[PDB]
Design a protein around this ligand. Structure first.
Ligand SMILES: NC(=O)c1ccc[n+]([C@@H]2O[C@H](COP(=O)([O-])OP(=O)(O)OC[C@H]3O[C@@H](n4cnc5c(N)ncnc54)[C@H](OP(=O)(O)O)[C@@H]3O)[C@@H](O)[C@H]2O)c1
Ligand SMILES: NC(=O)c1ccc[n+]([C@@H]2O[C@H](COP(=O)([O-])OP(=O)(O)OC[C@H]3O[C@@H](n4cnc5c(N)ncnc54)[C@H](OP(=O)(O)O)[C@@H]3O)[C@@H](O)[C@H]2O)c1
Lengths: 288, 287
């Protein structure tokens, strides 16, 4: 069936290729490290020597790269081939650089769609999988059926930045959660307590988060930060406890100092007696 | 019934008093701000003029204060009355200050137990509620039945530091999650997208976390950080994207810079091609 190019054979790239092949699609691939295509070439994919060859081979070109800098390095050696193609970039970078790259690709006569895949490689193509998409809807809809093999497509809008924004926002929560889990683990291991004793508590803590956060949405929407049940003076004190405990234990202080700086800036803005939601008032961009 | 003293009548202390009263216990109370006892006095509690009076009124003295410094301010004006009492401190502070306070209380002839309450005031005494305790087990067991009204007691050990350590570790995850939620929200609101559109995704993200973290426990236990499915070079790049996006949006950069610094230190230690669990190797204390 339809031949699709994929450039970028990291684990996400490979999982996407395997899924396109298992559903009848032909897949041309190219990677900076050619040896990395062996597993997918064996499963039915066509390696090709040059980026220009890979772009020329198909209408739809998927990029699974570390960043957008890598797109310029790869497609920079394929500018003439781009005319009439559809670039779907499934790579992390800033929203601003996502729009700049859309303009560069369209100036070379291709369409540009941004994607953000919201599961790891092992879940590509399964039921859990979903992908943010943004860019021209007519073009997107022409290729929805193929893209949906990777995960449920969530088309956010024509502003090509939206998929990147949602990706970065989810990443913000995700990387924080990892670093916080490792930080808490580090504090525990520092005291000689095995992590198996703490895990059930950490697990419960993360599983309960949705409950503590749901009510906060309205408070943040409205600037309504009542402190009667928990205040920034009490929570900011705790944050300083965490910082001192971290110094005492010889573990990282960057993460707990960053969180303490939220409480300190809030106290300086007079929000001592407000809910922790008031931190939003010092974290948000100036409406000024 | 049994008279228990609770000094510290903020949101959590009041919920504790209400629960002790609803179960027959008698409760003497005292606060730096006496007017704050009105609601609990009305529900059955006895206000008292002085800390010394509150300590003297009962065997078991619960303290729900903002920090341990407040314990010294309050019990500094008792001291003679402490002999033979049991102090259960349910306040945040450092583990080191928790041990220092146990020594000061025992030198004044009382027993000292540390607690960390793991639910907010509204859930005190409900099914969800649990509390870390640490200190002398015999003393703890003498008062277990009363303490259990506040939430499931988890005795961690006789090292009085353990409840505070577990409290601070849970707090680490908790305050991070809040700041991260607000930070992601801020990034979204900065671009003109309403929070209502993003919430379902944020919710799903937190609900999924337990699944992505369970396998990481073994990796951290063993120093086994395979990068085949996701590595620090790719995730570190992402963390830098978040930092740049945050500058672009004019939101806080402290939180994302802190997270990026984990990926940078890991790359510097050669863990570019390792799993994100390798950040543990940079975050941990020198062995
Ligand atoms: N892994 C995950 O679970 C996951 C999940 C969600 C989203 N993502 C996103 O998915 C994308 C891919 O991540 P991944 O883990 O599959 O792969 P990765 O480790 O970022 O590598 C992906 C590809 O980028 C290539 N590459 C990087 N810089 C390049 C450059 N300057 N020029 C040419 N090629 C370059 C690599 O080529 P080489 O093979 O030659 O090194 C590789 O083929 C990232 O943007 C990431 O944020 C990752
Ligand atoms: N609130 C929650 O949802 C929650 C969740 C679990 C655990 N905790 C922990 O529970 C503890 C109690 O905090 P809270 O939220 O109930 O309220 P809080 O704002 O910490 O106030 C608690 C009490 O401390 C007293 N206090 C503070 N500094 C004092 C000082 N220097 N001298 C004398 N009294 C002093 C206050 O008396 P005044 O009336 O004079 O201020 C107040 O009655 C904290 O350590 C907190 O970390 C909180």
């Amino acid at each position: 069936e339809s031949m699709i190019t994929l450039i970028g054979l990291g684990p996400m790239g490979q999982a996407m290729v395997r899924v396109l092949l298992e559903n009848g699609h032909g897949v041309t691939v190219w990677n900076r490290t050619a040896s990395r295509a062996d597993g997918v070439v064996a499963a039915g994919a066509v390696r090709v020597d040059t980026p220009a060859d890979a772009v020329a081979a198909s209408e739809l070109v998927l990029l699974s790269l570390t960043d957008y800098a890598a797109m310029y390095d790869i497609l920079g050696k394929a500018e003439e081939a781009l005319t009439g193609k559809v670039i779907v970039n499934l790579s992390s970078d800033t929203p601003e650089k996502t729009r700049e790259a859309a303009e560069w690709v369209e100036a070379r006569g291709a369409k540009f769609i941004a994607g953000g895949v919201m599961v790891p490689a092992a879940l590509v193509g399964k039921d859990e999988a979903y992908v943010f998409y943004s860019g021209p809807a007519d073009v997107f809809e022409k290729h929805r059926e193929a893209l949906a093999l990777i995960g449920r497509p969530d088309f956010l809008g024509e502003d090509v930045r939206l998929a990147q924004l949602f990706y970065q926002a989810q990443l913000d929560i995700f990387l924080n959660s990892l670093s916080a889990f490792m930080h808490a683990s580090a504090l525990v291991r520092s005291a000689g307590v095995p992590l198996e004793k703490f895990w059930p508590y950490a697990k419960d803590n993360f599983e309960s988060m949705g409950f503590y956060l749901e009510p906060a949405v309205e408070q943040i929407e409205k600037g309504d930060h009542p402190g009667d049940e928990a205040d920034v003076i009490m929570m900011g004190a705790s944050a300083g406890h965490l910082v001192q405990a971290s110094r005492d234990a010889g573990i990282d202080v960057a993460l707990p100092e960053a969180v303490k700086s939220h409480y300190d800036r809030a106290i300086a803005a007079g929000h001592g007696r407000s809910s922790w939601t008031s931190l939003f008032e010092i974290i948000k961009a100036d409406r000024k």
